[PDB]
């Protein structure tokens, strides 16, 4: 296939979480949540994440309950069997912008914005792809590219024409921690956040792996000593042959 049909492959950026011993930067995760909430959540859902998932990762229990309680969710029917709403609880999932696919596509010139809960695992490239894509809309499409109507040129997207327009511009978000909200900063933060959303066990997994590496390495070293020890009578055996 042509390189165009594949998409440009994203650079390997040095993420904080790259590295056998490295966790996510949780301050970046928090900033990334704020970008999601203020920019992406207009079109994209995050259906696999519940409010409780933010607690002790990006937010305290109080902050997350505050976010949940601002929303209305469907309750069980009342005693006359009429429908009812309730305020959100920590167990609730973060609600999406659209009721169904049809409504989503109608709002996006036919294109369906995917759910972002697994997108970092569901694309080759992961965080690097998300970062490259959001930051990689050229001012002008390369001369000779014919974009279909409602498409935007982005070389990282396979085929080149993506239904999502450039959305991150300097200062679309005002970070609560005073970090300058440049396009690159926001893309880095949101890409970190989405990577966390796809793999929230990441930090724990790598710490348990460190313990496992150490124990299993020691057991490997000892197993070799014990093998050599038990085998030495066989390896050291000598013969004297006197033909009968």
């Amino acid at each position: 296939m042509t390189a165009a049909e594949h998409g440009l492959h994203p650079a390997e950026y040095p993420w904080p979480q790259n590295g056998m011993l490295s966790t996510f930067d949780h301050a970046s995760l928090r900033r990334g949540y704020q970008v999601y909430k203020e920019v992406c959540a207009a079109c994209h859902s995050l259906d696999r994440i519940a409010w409780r998932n933010l607690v002790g990762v990006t937010h305290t229990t109080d902050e997350a309950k505050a976010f949940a309680e601002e929303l209305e969710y469907d309750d069980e029917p009342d005693d006359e069997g009429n429908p009812r709403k309730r305020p959100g609880k920590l167990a609730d999932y973060i609600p999406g912008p659209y009721p169904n696919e049809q409504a989503a596509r109608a709002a996006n010139q036919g294109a369906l914005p995917p759910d972002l809960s697994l997108i970092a695992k569901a694309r080759h490239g992961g965080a690097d792809y998300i970062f490259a894509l959001l930051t990689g809309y050229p001012d002008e499409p390369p001369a000779g590219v014919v974009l279909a109507p409602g498409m935007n040129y982005n070389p990282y997207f396979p085929g080149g024409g993506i239904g999502m327009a450039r959305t991150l511009f300097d200062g679309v978000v005002e970070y609560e921690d005073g970090t300058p909200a440049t396009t690159s900063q926001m893309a880095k933060d949101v890409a970190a956040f989405l990577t966390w959303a796809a793999e929230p066990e990441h930090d724990e997994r790598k710490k348990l792996g460190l313990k496992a590496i150490i124990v299993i390495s020691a057991m490997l070293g000892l197993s070799v000593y014990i093998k050599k020890f038990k085998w030495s009578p066989i390896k050291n055996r000598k013969f004297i042959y006197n033909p009968p």
Partner: protein
């Protein structure tokens, strides 16, 4: 090459202190360390693996309903 009472040369491999308690103790320290890490590893493996059977996070999120009492009037 002929006499079977002339034991072949094992001097490259023989330990001088082979009959001492120190000597046996060392090898049992290796065996025991290996048994120790295997025991610690098996405990960790079992405990982590079986914890999958304990209430999952979504279940634990549904118990423990908290209710205010300030809203509720007398009677």
């Amino acid at each position: 090459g002929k006499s079977t009472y002339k034991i072949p040369d094992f001097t490259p491999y023989l330990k001088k202190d082979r009959n001492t308690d120190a000597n046996r103790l060392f090898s049992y320290f290796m065996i025991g360390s290996f048994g120790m890490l295997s025991a610690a590893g098996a405990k960790a493996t079992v405990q982590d693996f079986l914890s999958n059977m304990s209430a999952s996070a979504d279940v634990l999120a549904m118990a423990k309903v908290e209710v205010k009492l300030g809203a509720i009037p007398l009677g």
